[model samples]
Target: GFDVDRDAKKLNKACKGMGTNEAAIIEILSGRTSDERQQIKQKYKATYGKELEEVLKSELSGNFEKTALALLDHPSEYAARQLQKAMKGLGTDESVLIEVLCTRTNKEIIAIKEAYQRLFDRSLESDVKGDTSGNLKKILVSLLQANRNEGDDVDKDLAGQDAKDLYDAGEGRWGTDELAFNEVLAKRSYKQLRATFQAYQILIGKDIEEAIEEETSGDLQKAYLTLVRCAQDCEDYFAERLYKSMKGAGTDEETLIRIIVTRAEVDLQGIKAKFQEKYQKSLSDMVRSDTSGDFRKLLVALLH
Candidate 1:
């Protein structure tokens, strides 16, 4: 059943005594994936007498505070904080820029943009415009633009042409052909990517993965291939996420959270199906065995 009252007390105790139990917080936050966090937060609040974000803020600090706040019962505010931090320093940090830019859903981006304006009294684009330059700046700003107003689906036909263009640019005729691949998969909308993949199927007359495997050779090529192939087969894509998530001593909690939360409302169900078919174990079970506490409890609740 549901025991929100008990969980709230448990959470409050954990928060009050631990100063900031980051691992504990992650366990709960990661456990719930993205959607269940909403459910559990509601249930917990209804049972208890406080907002979940308030309790967490009063307890946590630093990146732990930031992460906790960002991965809250409410996500938009969390995203805003994340956006704020990513742009705050003297020089733009490309890694944080990429992680947040590459991963966030379009809707999440919109929320971040709104929050940035509301809180900072500035535009996110203007901030980027002020802080960055060159291909990196162009790319980052373009990504921000796309994020702010991204179309919701990929274009398979365009993807196919882009794929063929990639083929032509690289193995078909031109030099190493990196730009072609980057242009479509790296730059296109998710909606456009889906269509592009479909287009690739028709344009190449073979699976894009097979084509890449056959055509490209070298580290960048292989990595790009992996990225494209993963994009092509979204199911197989997430099985890879599951595999990577559990590959080491400490889980790739970052990947774990990003994939599960981002996809929770997108293609996570498809991802779960892929896990069952490919690995013979439930994704929920893997997370449970790998983590614990209110965090584990929350994450586990998401799988349900």
Candidate 2:
């Protein structure tokens, strides 16, 4: 049950012969978690004298290639690569920036920052500063600081006060106080924020997100909403993202690949359940309908 050498050998054979055995490749690699895949990579190289990534780079192409390469990376490195890609192009992919930065826990963010530095020879914080601007920039940089409180002990009075601060900053005031919202949202623990959200509803007669929608605009709105959603239920938030990625006129394959591949070992089971609950269809069925060939096979294999 634990012979990675066998898997490595089989993988070598799968990629060796005429036309490449796509099914065999999918069967072996798609079944692996990031750690298993890494072990397979090490074994494959040790036995076959070739890098698995190089082999896959030669054999796979398009979304399949992207997904495969992504899956092989450590999650933090994968995210770091995504962040670099998001910022590298002419226009930044704000959604990618927000999704990765906002959804991560404080510890996760710290790991990603270290990985980003190791991979790119540059700091994530510096890169983010160079790439973004205005309040969007401020919120992202604040998140990149990885300073959010991680305490489990929540004070009801503090939550109530934080809720009022948020209310006053947005709906209760003449102008939005970006600083006040940023301070509470960025610095508060998720449990504390949840309590604050409940209090916000009681005070404002609107869900915090509804108030955010009515008041904030542009990338700032997205940052605020990302914080709100992540605080409420990060899994459900990502599940909604995964659903939207595939539900529209055309599939956003990058989004699909990013979420599925990155989160396959994390809360993907919860994401899958939420996806089914929201869409009334299994994630596998959606992947089957929306994608083709090895790409679909790999995604489906990872779904379970």
Candidate 3:
């Protein structure tokens, strides 16, 4: 189930016996679920007599290793810091910035900002704005500004309104309203979206996933399917996409990276579970089967 807390305790106990074995350290620190790293960042002080990040740095090295350490130490903030590090001097590392910002939740960016400030004594937003340029930076700032608070729960009535809105856009009247579709599906939080989908199920007799499949066709259909599948179960959403990309022939790096980076902090565990549940195969296996090089290694690092 990718329970990080359970594994952290196990790994902590194992560390006593191994005395910070790199294989064990990497195996535990690098391979852990983000939630586990988040937990360890908080709990490892008491259990291990040192900061988890410090311990990890003592053992691991390089950008990848530093990422793992930062994760255990401070989660997304570390990644944010890493992103800054990657882009500081030479050409901007658009890939790293995109990987972090495009995928992270608003709440996470806040945490990263706090951590970045504490670590570097500077604002994360300032660093990013100062370093990055153009529309890419603009979009990243927009996402970063979301400040993802857990927020309030969905109002069922509001969900119903949203549901009707989607229906109106897709099947109700004048040939599929694109603006409504974008607003409802693309902008809503996964939490709120979850409630909206549940509401839609109650409003209509059919499941929301089934309803979307029944309602549309073409890229619109694919987009709706992506929305529904991601909504129904994001992990499965990515797993199925990854399987299709890799199952027959060559891998789709874009799909692979998007799924991995986007889900890493959000609901990656759920995605991992969905991957296993839907395919009876692990996400890691599919990845190993499909790709190689540093990118694959990074993806593998996150899944762990």
Candidate 4:
């Protein structure tokens, strides 16, 4: 447990000094939960008449600044802002859109859309339509509907039928029936989708993801893969994303910060476990190797 006032006072003092105490700023902010961070921000404002965000903005730079700003927003609001940023300039950040929209639950998606509207005074769906086109647009728009069946109850018959539909639509047909893939992946319960994937393996003799890769191309492929991955296990999906974010030459600091900050409270423990299990390396180890200074420490703190 932490005293918000004390944390706020420390933060205020950290920013108050000449040449801003970056270490103290990271320590105070990184250790607190999002709600606690908000409380600290509020108390800082109440006590000093200065917004915590502004203070951090003046103090931090680069990835550290971005991470601090992300931490400050209510999670959904932060996500909504990310979505808007993805679409704001020329060209789109399709990966950000997919990672966010596909991974969130029906309720979270609804909340995100509401937050988007409140923050930007524009509809999330309209932005989806404007920024994306073709089947990619269709898939993302379907997800935004937030109408997926959330119940745990899975009809085996429906699952079997869905598997058959997928087979006929892909392997047994002239070309892929993109709509069938969209409808089943977008609307089915996660449990039901698991069953459907099993039946798909039995009938098609291929993993659903593999088959989707062999069958579809372009943004539709990304969307379907995201749907299957989310349906299978969200934690593993995120772990995979985080791993990729840190892989190869140069690090994707944007991806690294987004996943850690967004999933820190939700399932970062599970994500860390899965990351270690799959990669044979700890996430913190990777972060240490790939990042540096206070930015690295802040991420490490979030990882723990």
Candidate 5:
């Protein structure tokens, strides 16, 4: 039904000839289901008598090639180093940029900026500014301001206004108004966001997260999703994301490592406790099975 071999032949054609058709490769690879990719990846090996890894490597060069390989393969201390990897050498990985800025606290973000400068001798803001642009750029740069209202108090009036403003930004208008979402999202208190998120849900009888999806996808989609997760309940976000990383056919160690390491000092207890409550099993049990050696050991130790 998938015509896995047919897609493999398409990939072979993309890799053939003097000049590789990079766009053709993108079209083929990006179109398939991840599950279907493995089939085509194996089919390509048998048909072409070599791994898909080298198929791209033989022709494509630099980050484009590296990333295409990574996409096929499905593959970090991670924030500063990972950020460097994303923006370094040839191109940027905007997902990493979105994850770091969207979920981190203003204080934590400030710390990351300091660490980023200390490690790179370059300001994180400038690096991000260079790597990104438009809506994504605006969101990340505003987050770099490190001035999100950090307080437990909430003003219902303001939250109600934010609720309406956000509605106007996305579902309310015929077109999306990005800055409307950005101003409130980056600047509101976490507690205030808790109220705003609720108000938005009440106003539309639709989840803000879903509204964001209908609005757009890609970097902008992820940026809003990251914030809404935190706004919903940070513990739910971490616990469930971690569970997914450890679930299914393979482990997403990069996502796991960053979450476990970054939150270890701050709210790992909350995360551990929340995972127990959310999943009906300890996170340690999952770690015990999904990983091994120093990796598992350090991650398990971080559980406390």
Candidate 6:
């Protein structure tokens, strides 16, 4: 049913050669999704009497190495690994933590929790709770409860009330009631959020994104904005994320790699298309300009 046997041989040939066949490595590995990569993994060990993983570990290094191995994971497993990466180190990558936590659905979160449990030997909720604090910690765990409303039913009246509640909690009141903001976003129908945001704009005369910026601070603000942006326009939000990953100073290679690998089979094309329209440049142009050699080629290969 799959060409795993042939690809295994191709991989063995590429690795067996002196100085490494980086091109062949990229061609075969980047060409297929993880379903085939995992298959090739088994075949590589069986056919060559050596682990391809060990071979890759020995041969490739740096971002290319990590990215090559990245293709070997199932999506949920891959997402789980990224989530751990976001929280594993000191100080925490709150932006990354927020993106993974907010952008996914309840079912996706359930699968991720399962994968996270297996990969790290603990619950993702526990790790997040330990790493975060205050009202932000409360909201983060609320999302981890993994039962956010995703029903198709939209209630304009309910959304109108939500708008009023947001305005009341945000601007109408003297101080922000952060708990109200968290409950409305973490539990409301994502589709209904659009109506609520629309209602907020007419009532408050400004977008909720702006209101959130004006009202909140630090990781709290970013997490709230992440939920709003993800619900409002998933691909465009990702386009901005992909660009932001590459924007200032050194590229956040990890973030760039995760977004590309995570989105490749799903909505990467729309994200690429949006990147051009929104940024006045092609995604490949940025990819080409920012990366080089096998890493660049592998990214381009998957871009196809």
lDDT of 2 by residue, 141-221 (tens): 999888899999998999999988887787555688888888999999999999999998888789998988988898789
- Can you tell me which runs of candidate 3 are displaced by over 4 Å? 1-103, 108-150, 186-189, 206-224, 291-304
lDDT (10s digit) by residue, model 6, range 1-304:
7899999998888666733577788888878767788899999889999988788999788888888877877677888898787686446567777888888889878888999999989998988888888888999899989989989999999999999999888865578999999999999978999999999999889999999999999989999999999888888999998887887668888888888887777788888898899999988889888877668888887776
- Model 6, residue 299: what's the lDDT? 84
Q: What's the true lDDT of residue 23 in model 3?
A: 43
| Candidate 3 lDDT, 204-242, residue by residue in tens | 766766766766544345555565555556556556766
lDDT comparing candidate 2 with the true structure:
0.86
Model 3 residue 133 CA deviation in Å: 21
**Clash count (model 1, backbone only):** 27
- Predicted candidate 5 versus true structure: per-residue lDDT over 231-291, tens digit per residue: 6678887898899888866787777766665565567678888899999999999988998
Candidate 4, RMSD to the unseen true structure: 6.9
Model 6: which ten-residue window has the lowest total lDDT?
14-23
The digit string of per-residue lDDT tens for model 1 on 1-304 reads 7899999999999778664555466667766556677777788789997888888778655434544555663455555555566566546354345545555556666776777788779888788677664444555565566533256654555666776786676565545555556566566665566566666677667766676676655433444454465445666766776677777687756556545554566677888888888888888888878865555655665566
Q: Please report, in order, the local distance difference test score of every candidate based on alpha carbons.
A: 0.62, 0.86, 0.63, 0.87, 0.75, 0.85
Query: Any runs in candidate 6 off by more than 4 Å, and if so which?
Result: 1-20, 88-92, 172-174
* Tens digits of lDDT, candidate 4, 90-116: 355588998898888898899899999
Say which candidate scores most in lDDT. 4
Tell me the TM-score of each prediction against the true structure. 0.59, 0.90, 0.49, 0.90, 0.70, 0.89
Backbone clash pairs for candidate 5 read none
